[PDB]
């Protein structure tokens, strides 16, 4: 029914359009590549609704995000990540969602990395998957807000831990003990923890060993007070 008409949309409607966003949406590819925000979350929800409605065919999700923002710039909320995550979980039973991490996936995007359909969830070997320190760089409240503020931040931090255990099949106690400082996994460590299912090694590898930099000279003679030379590699 709708397969031939994805074809026909390609023939008449979705081939000509110029925008790279339009071409990507034609290829069922959703590139999350920017501090996730309110506008980004609404865009991703619209894209994912329409992509469901097209077909039960799969979706590709490339993630190069630095969290909700960088720590040196004003953060947004944690609710955009939860909104996108819930949309993805609702979608997944009717559409496979490969989720692939190119580059980086800091904190919130890490959730969006772990929210892909199990077994179809990958990160490049040269990526980093950060479960960063929790959270909220917004500091524009007063003391008249204290009575609410705790019941928010826990309310946010604990919500994330729960969702992360529903993606790594782990104990939320571990995730809580791991939040306290930003802990960023290698892809192999991530597969061990459960964040991703595979690691995408490149076809060809370039970087080799650098251990040939090691000195290996003898231990210093007991009668040689070393000078203060402070060198660089």
């Amino acid at each position: 029914r709708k397969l031939s008409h994805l074809r026909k949309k390609l023939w008449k409607e979705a081939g000509p359009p110029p925008d790279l966003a339009t071409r990507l949406f034609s290829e069922r590819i959703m590139y999350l590549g920017m501090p996730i925000d309110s506008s980004v979350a609404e865009l991703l929800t619209a894209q994912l609704f329409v992509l469901v409605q097209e077909a039960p065919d799969p979706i590709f999700f490339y993630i190069n995000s630095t969290g909700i923002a960088k720590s040196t710039t004003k953060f947004g909320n944690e609710h955009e990540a939860i909104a996108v995550y819930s949309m993805m979980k609702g979608v997944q039973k009717y559409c496979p969602i490969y989720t692939l991490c190119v580059g980086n996936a800091f904190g919130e995007a890490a959730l969006l990395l772990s929210a892909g359909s199990p077994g179809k969830r990958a990160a490049l070997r040269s990526s980093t998957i950060m479960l960063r320190q929790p959270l909220q760089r917004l500091g524009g409240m007063q003391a008249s807000d204290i009575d609410i503020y705790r019941k928010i931040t826990r309310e946010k931090t604990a919500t994330m831990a729960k969702y992360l255990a529903a993606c790594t099949k782990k104990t939320e106690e571990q995730i809580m003990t791991d939040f306290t400082r930003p802990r960023y996994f290698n892809p192999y460590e991530a597969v061990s923890y459960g964040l991703i299912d595979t690691v995408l090694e490149p076809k060809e590898e370039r970087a080799v060993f650098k251990d040939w930099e090691k000195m290996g000279s003898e231990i210093a003679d007991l009668g040689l007070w070393d000078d203060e030379e402070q060198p660089l590699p």
Binding site: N77, H79, I82, Y85, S86, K93, I148, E155
Partner: protein
């Protein structure tokens, strides 16, 4: 069909605008499914309350907020008084809305307005802003509902693309 779908994830917004969107949802004669994702402050909470009863869903990690409007006044003494009457009447308007959307006593709702009150999914159901917690199976059912409602337009579009191709 023509039952409106509102997707709500909003951390703020003036209370009057939330009241406006609530009433707008109200005068639409068909239903109105409002699904809150992640958060809904005062304006977005008023939008959520305005959905058809039986179709105000809130996701597990969603946090609605009942509170009174935040304002600012500048003018003469009579201007100060008349504008504070603005704001108090708006508080009573919101209390009226929350009673006619939750069945809670307007006294208790006004107290909840006095100090900004956050609510999580279960408690948001408890007060009466939403009917169902949008867990994953609920979310699946919602995207199924979107499937069925959009599929009429989809079939129209099917036949048109058949003609054009």
């Amino acid at each position: 069909s023509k039952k409106v779908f509102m997707i709500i994830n909003s951390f703020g917004g003036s209370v009057g605008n939330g009241i406006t969107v609530h009433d707008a949802l109200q005068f639409i004669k068909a239903g109105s499914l409002t699904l809150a994702l992640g958060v809904a402050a005062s304006a977005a909470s008023l939008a959520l309350a305005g959905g058809t009863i039986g179709e105000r869903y809130v996701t597990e990690g969603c946090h609605t907020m009942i509170h009174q409007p935040e304002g600012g006044l500048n003018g003469q003494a009579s201007d100060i008084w008349i504008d504070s009457q603005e704001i108090m009447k708006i508080r009573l308007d919101v209390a009226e809305i929350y009673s006619l959307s939750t069945y809670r006593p307007r006294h208790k709702i006004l107290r909840d307005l006095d100090r900004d009150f956050y609510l999580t999914a279960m408690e948001t159901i408890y007060y009466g802003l939403a009917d169902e917690i949008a867990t994953n199976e609920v979310m699946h059912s919602i995207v199924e509902m979107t499937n069925q409602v959009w599929s009429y337009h989809d079939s129209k579009q099917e036949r048109l693309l058949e003609s054009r191709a």
